Amino acid sequence: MWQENKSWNAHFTEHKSQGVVVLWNENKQQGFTNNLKRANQAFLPASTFKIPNSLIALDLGVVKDEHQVFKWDGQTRDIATWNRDHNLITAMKYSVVPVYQEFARQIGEARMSKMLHAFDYGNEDISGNVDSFWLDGGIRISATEQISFLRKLYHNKLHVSERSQRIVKQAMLTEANGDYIIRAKTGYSTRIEPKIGWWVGWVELDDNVWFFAMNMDMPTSDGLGLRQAITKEVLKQEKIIP
Amino acid sequence: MWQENKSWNAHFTEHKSQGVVVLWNENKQQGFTNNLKRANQAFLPASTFKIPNSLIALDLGVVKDEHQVFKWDGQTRDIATWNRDHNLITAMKYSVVPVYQEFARQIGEARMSKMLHAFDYGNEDISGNVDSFWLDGGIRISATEQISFLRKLYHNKLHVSERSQRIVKQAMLTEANGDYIIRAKTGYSTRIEPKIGWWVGWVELDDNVWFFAMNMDMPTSDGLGLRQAITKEVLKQEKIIP
Numbered sequence: 140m141w142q143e144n145k146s147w148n149a150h151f152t153e154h155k156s157q158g159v160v161v162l163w164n165e166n167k168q169q170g171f172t173n174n175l176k177r178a179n180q181a182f183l184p185a186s187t188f189k190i191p192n193s194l195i196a197l198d199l200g201v202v203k204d205e206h207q208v209f210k211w212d213g214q215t216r217d218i219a220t221w222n223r224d225h226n227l228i229t230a231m232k233y234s235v236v237p238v239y240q241e242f243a244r245q246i247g248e249a250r251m252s253k254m255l256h257a258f259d260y261g262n263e264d265i266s267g268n269v270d271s272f273w274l275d276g277g278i279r280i281s282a283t284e285q286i287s288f289l290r291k292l293y294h295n296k297l298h299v300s301e302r303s304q305r306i307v308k309q310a311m312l313t314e315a316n317g318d319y320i321i322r323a324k325t326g327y328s329t330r331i332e333p334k335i336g337w338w339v340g341w342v343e344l345d346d347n348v349w350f351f352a353m354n355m356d357m358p359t360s361d362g363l364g365l366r367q368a369i370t371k372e373v374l375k376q377e378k379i380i381p
Numbered sequence: 382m383w384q385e386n387k388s389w390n391a392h393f394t395e396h397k398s399q400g401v402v403v404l405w406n407e408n409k410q411q412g413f414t415n416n417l418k419r420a421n422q423a424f425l426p427a428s429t430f431k432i433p434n435s436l437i438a439l440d441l442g443v444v445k446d447e448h449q450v451f452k453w454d455g456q457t458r459d460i461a462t463w464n465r466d467h468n469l470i471t472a473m474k475y476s477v478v479p480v481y482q483e484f485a486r487q488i489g490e491a492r493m494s495k496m497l498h499a500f501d502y503g504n505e506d507i508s509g510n511v512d513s514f515w516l517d518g519g520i521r522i523s524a525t526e527q528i529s530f531l532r533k534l535y536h537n538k539l540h541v542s543e544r545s546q547r548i549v550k551q552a553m554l555t556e557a558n559g560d561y562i563i564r565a566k567t568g569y570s571t572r573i574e575p576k577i578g579w580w581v582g583w584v585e586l587d588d589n590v591w592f593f594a595m596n597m598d599m600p601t602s603d604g605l606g607l608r609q610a611i612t613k614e615v616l617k618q619e620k621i622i623p
């Protein structure tokens with residue numbers, strides 16, 4: 140049910156980087172990865188936590204819907220896309236950290252904790268600040284655990300309303316053409332070593348869906364584009380996308 | 382306001398064709414079109430009717446969700462992609478008429494009539510066969526009446542459940558980008574003259590959404606690609622998309 144395929148290491152070697160790509164064929168119920176040990180290694184989720192965060196905030200009424208505007212607080216920060224107004228969809232696309240830090244503060248630690256235990260999310264530990272634990276706190280999740288989380292989301296089986304799950308899957312939209320749809324979330328763990336980049340989500344085809352979760356060492360922000368590029372190369376190699 | 386911009390007719394005559402593009406700017410509550418009379422002329426919706434027909438089917442339980450499979454009945458039809466199993470997503474993408482004819486027969490004339498009345502859809506007239514009235518019966522809808530119908534859909538304001546409207550808006554997904562999202566439905570009125578091609582939906586930007594409804598004369602299926610091509614050129618002229 141899980142098969143190791145180190146063909147894909149060649150895609151990490153070229154860009155002088157290392158990491159893990161994990162695919163899951165949903166129809167056949169079979170998993171593939173270049174490195175099953177790192178596949179089960181738990182790191183900080185970083186901005187991939189915006190997926191469970193969105194669900195909790197929506198199911199609790201902190202966020203009314205995907206159209207609610209969240210005004211910029213006036214403190215100009217070092218990423219240009221952060222210094223403007225945002226809704227749920229744009230706050231996710233640009234990983235607007237302070238928007239989600241406000242969601243977290245209003246969710247509170249007690250309710251945040253019960254929801255992560257309900258979601259089966261990683262080690263389910265929110266040690267640290269409630270508004271930064273996914274960046275520098277105790278939470279840990281492996282790539283396989285990301286897949287398990289994403290499958291429950293895809294099947295509307297997480298312990299939230301169907302409406303919350305449909306909104307977040309709508310917000311996860313990244314790319315779509317006549318061949319496929321990609322719903323995913325990027326992540327850049329920047330505050331605690333090892334600095335790693337994430338990309339987790341799934342590829343919707345006509346007659347299948349392929350879940351993926353990847354992470355890789357990211358010692359510099361100049362390598363962030365590799366997260367999508369390397370994962371697409373693996374998808375191309377396994378004829379999943381043209 | 383409404384404003385007529387005949388500049389766009391260049392795009393129609395460069396391909397020896399004739400049609401109307403209707404644009405609605407949601408944030409500014411202002412509309413635009415190259416031909417105001419044709420914008421309010423009502424044609425057969427053809428397969429753009431798959432939008433209301435999906436909503437009704439989902440809301441009534443004829444279709445339980447978007448994963449439910451409608452298996453091929455074995456009759457080999459002229460369009461290759463019709464001769465296979467489908468779900469709601471792929472049936473909509475490939476305008477699989479026989480799957481939607483089955484929905485119409487299970488909905489029946491009475492409930493279908495009542496729903497279009499509540500939807501305020503076009504002339505609300507299902508005269509003709511219960512499973513082909515949108516292709517050769519008495520139903521008619523204008524391009525602006527399409528905008529008005531899509532606007533309620535986008536805002537979850539139709540009489541059907543929020544769940545129905547969110548599922549259909551998912552199935553409408555056509556193209557998604559770092560710059561925009563397009564939810565739309567294609568149509569081709571082939572049975573009653575004049576043969577026309579449709580494209581209706583909207584373009585989601587970061588802070589705005591542009592609704593559009595277009596139709597054009599279509600004597601032959603060879604020119605169906607001009608629907609999207611001409612609409613995108615208009616979107617490029619108005620600097621909505623890059």
Ligand SMILES: O=S(=O)(O)c1ccc2c(c1)Cc1cc(S(=O)(=O)O)ccc1-2
Pocket residue numbers: 186232233234236274325326327329330363
């Ligand atoms: O590539 S993305 O995953 O979209 C991405 C790109 C940049 C940053 C983040 C995510 C999260 C983050 C946190 C911080 S901070 O903790 O220093 O405040 C600084 C930059 C970024």
Ligand SMILES: O=S(=O)(O)c1ccc2c(c1)Cc1cc(S(=O)(=O)O)ccc1-2
Pocket residue numbers: 428474475476478516567568569571572605
């Ligand atoms: O470009 S699309 O809007 O996706 C499109 C393209 C072809 C056809 C349809 C839609 C609806 C349709 C009906 C018929 S029939 O009435 O003769 O059975 C034949 C062909 C087509």
Ligand SMILES: [Cl-]
Pocket residue numbers: 292293294308
């Ligand atoms: Cl889904």
Ligand SMILES: [Cl-]
Pocket residue numbers: 308309312550551554
């Ligand atoms: Cl979507």
Ligand SMILES: [Cl-]
Pocket residue numbers: 295301445446
């Ligand atoms: Cl459902």
Ligand code: NA
Pocket residue numbers: 426427428429476567568569570
């Ligand atoms: Na059609």
